[PDB]
Amino acid sequence: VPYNEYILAPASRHLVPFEVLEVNGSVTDPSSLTQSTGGNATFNGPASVTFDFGRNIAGIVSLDIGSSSTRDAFIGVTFTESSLWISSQACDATADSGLDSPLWFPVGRGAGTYTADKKHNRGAFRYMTLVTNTTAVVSVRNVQINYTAAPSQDLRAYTGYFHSNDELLNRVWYAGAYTNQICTIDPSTGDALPFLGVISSDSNITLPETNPWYSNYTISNGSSTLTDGAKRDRLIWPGDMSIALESVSVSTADLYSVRTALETLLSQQRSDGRLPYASEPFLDLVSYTYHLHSLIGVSYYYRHSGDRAWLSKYWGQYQKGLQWALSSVDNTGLANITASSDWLRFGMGGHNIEANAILYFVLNEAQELSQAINNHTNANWTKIASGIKSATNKNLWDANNGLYKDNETTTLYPQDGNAWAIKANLTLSTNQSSTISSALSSRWGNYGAPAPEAADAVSPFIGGFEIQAHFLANQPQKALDLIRLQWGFMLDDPRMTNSTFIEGYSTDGTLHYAPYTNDARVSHAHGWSTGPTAALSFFVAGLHLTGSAGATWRFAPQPGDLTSVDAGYTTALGLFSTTFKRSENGDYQELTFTTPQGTTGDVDLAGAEGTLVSADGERVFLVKGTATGITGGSWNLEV
Numbered sequence: 320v321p322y323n324e325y326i327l328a329p330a331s332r333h334l335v336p337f338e339v340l341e342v343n344g345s346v347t348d349p350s351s352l353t354q355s356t357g358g359n360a361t362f363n364g365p366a367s368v369t370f371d372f373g374r375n376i377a378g379i380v381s382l383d384i385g386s387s388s389t390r391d392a393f394i395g396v397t398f399t400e401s402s403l404w405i406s407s408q409a410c411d412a413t414a415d416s417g418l419d420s421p422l423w424f425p426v427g428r429g430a431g432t433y434t435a436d437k438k439h440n441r442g443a444f445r446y447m448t449l450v451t452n453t454t455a456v457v458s459v460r461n462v463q464i465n466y467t468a469a470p471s472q473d474l475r476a477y478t479g480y481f482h483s484n485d486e487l488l489n490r491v492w493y494a495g496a497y498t499n500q501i502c503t504i505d506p507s508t509g510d511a512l513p514f515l516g517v518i519s520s521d522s523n524i525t526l527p528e529t530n531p532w533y534s535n536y537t538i539s540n541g542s543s544t545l546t547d548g549a550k551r552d553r554l555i556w557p558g559d560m561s562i563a564l565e566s567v568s569v570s571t572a573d574l575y576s577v578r579t580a581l582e583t584l585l586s587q588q589r590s591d592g593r594l595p596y597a598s599e600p601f602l603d604l605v606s607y608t609y610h611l612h613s614l615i616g617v618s619y620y621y622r623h624s625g626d627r628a629w630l631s632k633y634w635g636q637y638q639k640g641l642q643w644a645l646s647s648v649d650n651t652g653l654a655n656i657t658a659s660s661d662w663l664r665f666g667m668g669g670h671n672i673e674a675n676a677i678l679y680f681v682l683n684e685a686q687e688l689s690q691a692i693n694n695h696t697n698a699n700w701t702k703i704a705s706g707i708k709s710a711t712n713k714n715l716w717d718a719n720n721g722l723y724k725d726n727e728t729t730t731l732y733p734q735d736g737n738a739w740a741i742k743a744n745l746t747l748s749t750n751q752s753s754t755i756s757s758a759l760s761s762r763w764g765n766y767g768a769p770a771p772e773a774a775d776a777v778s779p780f781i782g783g784f785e786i787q788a789h790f791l792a793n794q795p796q797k798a799l800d801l802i803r804l805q806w807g808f809m810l811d812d813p814r815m816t817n818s819t820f821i822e823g824y825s826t827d828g829t830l831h832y833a834p835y836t837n838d839a840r841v842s843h844a845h846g847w848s849t850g851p852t853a854a855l856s857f858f859v860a861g862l863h864l865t866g867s868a869g870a871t872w873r874f875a876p877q878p879g880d881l882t883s884v885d886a887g888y889t890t891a892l893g894l895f896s897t898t899f900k901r902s903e904n905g906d907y908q909e910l911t912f913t914t915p916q917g918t919t920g921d922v923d924l925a926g927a928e929g930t931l932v933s934a935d936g937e938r939v940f941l942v943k944g945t946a947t948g949i950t951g952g953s954w955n956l957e958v
């Protein structure tokens with residue numbers, strides 16, 4: 320595991336507080352609980368000691384109590400991911416209104432270990448506060464956390480690595496990787512929303528009132544499942560997978576946790592063929608977009624797993640699911656959406672650009688799965704795809720604004736649909752894609768890229784899709800600059816975790832998120848904001864899987880302003896790696912790339928002149944940086 324120094328995952332599953340932030344009251348030696356083999360912090364009466372673990376973590380709190388003056392003594396534990404919500408009186412929020420209660424332990428009953436329930440596992444918290452409710456003098460021998468995230472993983476045994484000359488990019492990579500494994504949970508501790516239906520937005524739980532909190536629900540079978548957010552929801556969401564899967568793939572290869580989540584959604588497919596908006600405990604809302612995002616997960620899993628048997632097991636369910644979505648396509652050749660529910664965007668309906676771009680992407684990915692199982696293509700899927708591309712550009716493209724309309728009925732040009740159009744090749748030219756890229760970077764604010772479809776929100780979900788779209792319009796600089804702007808804020812703003820990545824915020828730097836009135840409920844660990852991890856491995860390093868487990872590949876690095884990149888990730892067939900070092904001229908003075916043997920791929924080095932030489936003696940001369948159909952192995956650029 321190269322560059323393991325950048326890995327933010329814990330080396331142990333039993334963690335002791337790293338530093339002491341704030342001590343209110345009288346505690347004689349609070350920093351004694353900072354050590355692994357010590358501890359006698361004596362809380363003299365009502366007091367509070369805030370701790371900092373230095374990173375977002377998850378687990379079950381355990382207190383060893385040595386001395387208590389009173390038998391009615393209590394020790395409370397609170398948790399928060401952000402510094403904004405550090406309080407002795409309450410935790411963060413997992414409900415649509417109100418901060419969560421402190422975990423209370425009756426430490427006066429006797430000396431000994433006091434461990435929390437598995438239902439009171441906290442899914443994500445960087446700062447932990449211990450508070451005393453009584454006049455008792457209580458000795459705390461030890462406070463430790465049992466790290467519960469990524470249960471079936473070796474937390475730091477990374478299958479992938481990324482290093483460049485920009486340390487912010489290197490830190491964003493390992494942050495998103497760690498963001499994903501912290502929302503990778505034991506399915507027994509799912510649904511952090513126990514009061515869905517009970518507590519709502521207009522419920523105004525306030526001031527001294529705190530809220531009960533537990534997890535409970537076995538949202539999936541198996542040992543481990545990837546969820547949307549570590550602290551809150553803790554559910555399986557289809558749309559979040561189109562970012563987290565590949566980011567998980569290039570870091571830990573925990574495709575087991577992904578398969579766990581995809582099979583849970585597939586098992587809940589309706590009679591119609593409609594895949595669900597979320598996993599079982601959540602409300603039965605109809606989403607055309609998220610239904611296709613689950614079909615994207617079937618394609619994405621076969622691409623990275625290589626498991627043709629898994630594909631055949633779910634090929635019929637995939638085909639029935641596509642059928643349900645093709646039903647909304649009308650005479651215009653576009654799909655008319657009558658279901659509004661999406662990620663947060665408000666205008667989903669009619670001939671939406673995002674929906675039709677996702678359907679086009681799904682239809683073309685369905686053709687390769689057809690070729691995988693049946694060794695042919697579907698002609699019906701080809702015409703519907705061609706019709707979407709024709710009608711989207713005829714009815715929704717505006718050449719003065721350089722962007723697609725959300726529908727024919729509006730002046731709004733959305734971030735999701737325009738980033739998805741380049742991702743789906745719904746565009747007719749690289750220049751049309753380059754025009755969208757320029758027009759989306761036009762709207763960038765001081766804290767990130769805005770989504771006008773979702774009020775004042777800065778969505779890292781769509782931002783990651785926009786990063787891939789910038790690269791695909793062959794504008795690598797704008798993509799890197801969005802990461803440095805948006806994710807540098809997400810990683811280095813003092814109200815963040817410096818380890819995991821937030822679910823969303825707003826154009827004004829405030830960490831308020833549009834769908835929530837409870838800003839403390841926002842998740843600083845969401846896997847759908849881990850896109851830069853996969854994109855830096857795919858587009859900057861150039862390591863593209865174009866076939867199952869990399870059976871076919873494309874080595875096309877787009878380094879931008881970077882001078883040195885050393886990156887690699889692992890599939891079933893082998894390791895995909897590269898170590899290239901450019902110059903002030905922007906020309907590769909050193910390039911080595913590694914692909915598994917018994918595989919075939921193409922190489923685009925962008926005008927770079929030289930010969931690619933294999934370790935087994937093969938030599939291929941480049942034509943405008945072009946190499947076509949070269950066999951797998953480790954190749955060196957020789958000038």
Ligand SMILES: *[C@@H]1O[C@H](CO)[C@@H](O)[C@H](O)[C@H]1NC(C)=O
Nearest residue numbers: 391393423424451452453454
């Ligand atoms: C402190 O809090 C615990 C748990 O909420 C409660 O049972 C106890 O009565 C409280 N004691 C005082 C002195 O407030």
Ligand SMILES: *[C@@H]1O[C@H](CO)[C@@H](O)[C@H](O)[C@H]1NC(C)=O
Nearest residue numbers: 438513532533534535536537
């Ligand atoms: C969830 O925990 C609550 C206790 O807070 C209990 O009422 C319920 O039975 C639990 N559900 C499951 C599935 O364990």
Ligand SMILES: *[C@@H]1O[C@H](CO)[C@@H](O)[C@H](O)[C@H]1NC(C)=O
Nearest residue numbers: 666668669725726728729731
């Ligand atoms: C078109 O998009 C706008 C903005 O997204 C939305 O408000 C409007 O309802 C949409 N129209 C239809 C017919 O869906």
Ligand SMILES: *[C@@H]1O[C@H](CO)[C@@H](O)[C@H](O)[C@H]1NC(C)=O
Nearest residue numbers: 708743744745746747748749
């Ligand atoms: C994208 O579309 C253009 C025409 O609009 C086509 O020439 C090109 O081959 C397409 N690219 C891919 C990867 O399908």
Ligand SMILES: *[C@@H]1O[C@H](CO)[C@@H](O)[C@H](O)[C@H]1NC(C)=O
Nearest residue numbers: 325373490810811813817818
């Ligand atoms: C954030 O993390 C980096 C390492 O990833 C570290 O160098 C830096 O000091 C940290 N900053 C804060 C404020 O914790």
